[PDB]
């Protein structure tokens, strides 16, 4: 009942037992980590609880290289491990802490209770490492505020599924819950209410809780579109519309805009330790810019004519430069690439439009840019039946291109946009549909047997329910 299915699993028929109050998870004497390693100590304790809730007496955890116990994970973090289940001492070996975390999850999925309640595990050898290094979940806390507790629950479910990136789409048009220290008015005026806000301490808590599970927190502060809430607190930032709505995208002709964004993103570079910041750039509406006389004047001032993609490009290039100056990397939705913005090498492009996405993947990678796929995994787009199968059947590298282009494909994300999602329905909608994407992103390309996937996923889903994650059914049946 392994999910995702490990790269290599070899088992024997020899059954071994475990005794809950005489089973300890501890550091191997040769490990680079010890009791000082909070991340491993906390993992040992919570996995002991998950496991239980001829005798294998102990699980020894050996970290081989500098452990990275006090660091934040990044795109290059080594999540490989091996697990040797035998008596009297099983061994989990990993280059780094990140792999040991993954291996503790796998170990917990191997232990089961027989018909008489006896805790049991098969002698086995597992070798495992992920197919892709970027394995994300997008949550949207603007369309609806999500209490910190459900973000923490989502992070727990992510760990059970070996997801390693929380793409936090923190702000958008409808609300601005991010409490900024340098700009207090953004949240004071842009939040749904003063109790629908993420304080600096809420953000640190999420980041740290994520870190303890090997999960990166990727912040998205989408501009120049998707910024209506920003205008409440930052005066003169948005373009006033002459006519359809009242305010449009951020005004890219003003120096106060770039001055504001410089101070703002500098704060973000300090709050969020991840190497990458997602700058957004999706669905920018030009009508408001088109209808504005001052923008029209700016357009002719540098020969952009009536091509507002050049103005969007001009804007996004200035933001990308601000990010590079503060030594962070940038991620961008595909529109930025499609509208001909000049992107510096290393800029990641997230391909989200479902129309000819394989052809988009070829173009991005042929231009030399790293790419992330979310297009066929828009989990907010619900439908009747077993749609997990359609997410599962995606083979992300089925696009035209050389091996060099295929090496630029670094992973993907399951996206849960928030228009129709809040605390009442997030979890059942997310899980186990996102588990399908999790396996496609972790396991080998040839892991695609549908019957076996259904068998393992129904049990994995029951395991999620047992651990307090209200994952919905795949089909008729029951748990226990």
Ligand X SMILES: *[C@@H]1O[C@H](CO)[C@@H](O[C@@H]2O[C@H](CO)[C@@H](O)[C@H](O)[C@H]2NC(C)=O)[C@H](O)[C@H]1NC(C)=O
Ligand Y SMILES: CC(=O)N[C@H]1NC[C@H](CO)[C@H](O)[C@@H]1O
Identify the residue among 1, 11, 152, 423 touching ligand X (CB under 6 A).
11
d(CA 437, CA 223): 28
Nearest distance from residue 110's CB to ligand X, in Å?
10
Which of the listed partners (ligand X, ligand Y, its own copies, none) does 116 bind, with a CB threshold of 5 to 8 Å by partner kind?
none
Tell me: does residue 54 bind ligand X (CB under 6 A): no
Token pair 């996102």: residue = 434
Partner whose binding site includes residue 11, from ligand X, its own copies, ligand Y, none (CB under 5 to 8 Å by kind): ligand X
Which pair of structure tokens corresponds to residue 312? Answer: 């969007």
In the complex, which residues of this chain contact its own copies (CB under 8 A)? 142-145, 174-175, 192-193, 195-196, 380-385, 418-422, 424-425, 427-429, 465, 470-478, 480
The torsion of the CA quartet 455, 456, 461, 463, rounded to 10 degrees, works out to 120
Exposure letters 121-132 (e unless 16+ CB within 10 A, then b):
bebbebebbbbb
Asked if 378 is part of the footprint of ligand Y (rule: CB under 6 A), the reply reads yes
> Of ligand Y, its own copies, ligand X, none, which one sits near residue 13, judging by CB under 5 to 8 A according to partner kind?
ligand X
CB-based contacts of 95, cutoff 8 Å, min separation 6 = 63, 64, 65, 78, 80, 81
- Is residue 116 a contact point for ligand X (CB under 6 A)? no
In angstroms, what CA-CA distances link 266 with 182, 198, 260, 314, 319?
10, 18, 10, 20, 11
Nearest-approach distance from CB 62 to its own copies, in angstroms: 38
Considering CB distances under 5 to 8 angstroms, the limit depending on partner class, which of ligand Y, its own copies, ligand X, none binds residue 15? ligand X
User: Any contact of residue 417 with ligand Y (CB under 6 A)?
Assistant: yes
Residue 265 or 388 having the CB closest to its own copies: 388
Helix (H, G, I), strand (E, B) or coil at 411: strand
> 283 contacts which partner out of its own copies, ligand X, ligand Y, none, CB within 5 to 8 A by kind?
ligand Y
Residue 445 Cβ vs ligand X, minimum distance, rounded to whole Å: 23
CA proximity to 458, closest of 391, 395, 386: 386
Positions of E strands within 292-358? 329-333, 348-351
Q: Which is nearer to ligand Y, 337 or 352 (CB)?
A: 352
Active site annotation includes 283 = yes
**Which of ligand Y, ligand X, its own copies, none is residue 351 near (CB under 5 to 8 Å by kind)?**
none
- The C-alpha atoms of residue 99 and residue 92 are separated, in whole angstroms, by 9
Residues 119-158 that bind ligand X (CB under 6 A): 122
Q: Is 1 in the site for ligand X (CB under 6 A)?
A: no
Q: Is residue 282 near ligand Y by the rule CB under 6 A? A: yes
Choosing among ligand X, its own copies, ligand Y, none, which partner's interface includes residue 147 (Cβ < 5 to 8 Å by kind)? none
Considering the complex, what minimum distance in angstroms separates the CB of residue 52 from ligand X? 19
Binds ligand X (CB under 6 A): choice among 15, 152, 344, 450 = 15
Residue nearest to ligand X (CB): 13
Q: Which is nearer to its own copies, 303 or 385 (CB)?
A: 385
3-state SS class at 401: coil
| Shortest Cβ 172–ligand X spacing (Å) | 31
Sign of CA dihedral 111, 113, 119, 122: negative
- From 6, 130, 28, select the one nearest 79 (Cα to Cα): 130
CB of 458 to ligand Y, least distance (A): 19
The residues in 324-363 that bind ligand Y, with binding defined as CB under 6 A, are 333, 352
Complex with its own copies: residue 192 or 304, whichever CB lies closer: 192
Looking at the Cβ atoms of 421 and 441, the one nearer to its own copies is: 421
Of 336, 173, 319, 343, the closest CA to residue 258 belongs to 319
Cis peptide before 130 (omega within 30 of 0): no
CB 408 within 8 A of CB 371: yes
Smaller CB distance to ligand Y: residue 333 or 431? Answer: 333
Question: Which of 283, 297, 354, 449 touches ligand Y (CB under 6 A)?
Answer: 283
The catalytic residue among 270, 283, 395, 419 is 283
Taking the C-alpha atoms of residue 362 and residue 406, their distance in angstroms, rounded to an integer, is 9
b vs e for 260-271, b when ≥16 Cβ sit within 10 Å of the residue's Cβ? bbeebbeebbeb
Could you give phi then psi for residue 154, rounded to 5 degrees?
-60, -40
Q: How far is the CB of 380 from ligand Y (least distance, A)?
A: 5
Separation between Cα atoms, residue 104 and residue 93, nearest integer Å = 10
The yes or no reply on residue 380 touching ligand Y (CB under 6 A) is yes
Closer CB to ligand Y, 338 or 380, in the complex:
380
Residues assigned a catalytic role: 283
Residues that bind ligand X (CB under 6 A): 11, 13, 15, 122
């Amino acid at each position: 009942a392994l999910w995702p299915l490990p790269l290599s699993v070899k088992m024997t028929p020899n059954l071994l037992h475990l005794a809950p109050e005489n089973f300890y998870i501890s550091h191997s004497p040769n490990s680079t980590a010890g009791p000082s390693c909070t991340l491993l100590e906390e993992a040992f304790r919570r996995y002991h609880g998950y496991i239980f809730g001829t005798q294998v007496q102990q699980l020894l955890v050996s970290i081989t290289l500098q452990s990275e116990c006090d660091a934040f994970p990044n795109i290059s973090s080594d999540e490989s491990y091996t697990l040797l289940v035998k008596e009297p001492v099983a061994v989990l070996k990993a280059n780094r802490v990140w792999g040991a975390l993954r291996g503790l999850e796998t170990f917990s999925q191997l232990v089961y209770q027989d018909s008489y309640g006896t805790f049991t595990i098969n002698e086995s050898t597992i070798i495992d490492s992920p197919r892709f290094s970027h394995r994300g979940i997008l949550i949207d806390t603007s369309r609806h505020y999500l209490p910190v507790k459900i973000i923490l629950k989502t992070l727990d479910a992510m760990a059970f599924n070996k997801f390693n990136v929380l793409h936090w789409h923190i702000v958008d048009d409808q609300s601005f819950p991010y409490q900024s220290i340098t700009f207090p008015e953004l949240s004071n005026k842009g939040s749904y209410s003063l109790s629908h806000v993420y304080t600096p301490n809420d953000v640190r808590m999420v980041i740290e809780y994520a870190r303890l599970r090997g999960i990166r927190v990727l912040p998205e502060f989408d501009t120049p579109g998707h910024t209506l809430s920003w205008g409440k607190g930052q005066k003169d930032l948005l373009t006033p519309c002459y006519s359809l709505d009242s305010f449009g995208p951020i005004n890219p002709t003003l120096n106060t805009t770039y001055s504001f964004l410089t101070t703002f993103f500098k704060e973000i570079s300090e709050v969020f330790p991840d190497q990458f910041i997602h700058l957004g750039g999706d669905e920018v509406e030009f009508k408001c810019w088109e209808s504005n006389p001052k923008i029209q004047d700016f357009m002719r001032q540098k020969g952009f004519g009536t091509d507002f993609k050049k103005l969007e490009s001009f804007y996004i290039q200035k933001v990308l430069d601000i990010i590079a100056t503060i030594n962070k990397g940038s991620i961008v939705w595909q529109e930025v690439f499609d509208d001909k913005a000049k992107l510096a090498p290393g800029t990641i492009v997230e391909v989200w439009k479902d129309s000819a996405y394989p052809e988009e993947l070829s173009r991005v990678t042929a231009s030399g840019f790293p790419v992330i796929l979310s297009a066929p995994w828009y989990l907010d787009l619900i439908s009747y039946g077993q749609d997990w199968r359609k997410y599962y059947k995606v083979e992300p590298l089925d696009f035209g291109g050389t091996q060099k282009q295929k090496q630029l494909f670094i992973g993907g994300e399951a996206c849960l946009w928030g228009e129709y999602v809040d605390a009442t329905n997030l979890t059942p909608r997310l899980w186990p549909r996102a588990s399908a994407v999790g396996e496609r992103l972790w396991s080998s390309k040839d892991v695609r047997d549908m019957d076996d996937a259904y068998d393992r996923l129904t049990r994995h889903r029951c395991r999620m329910v047992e651990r307090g994650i209200a994952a919905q059914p795949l089909y008729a049946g029951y748990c226990n």
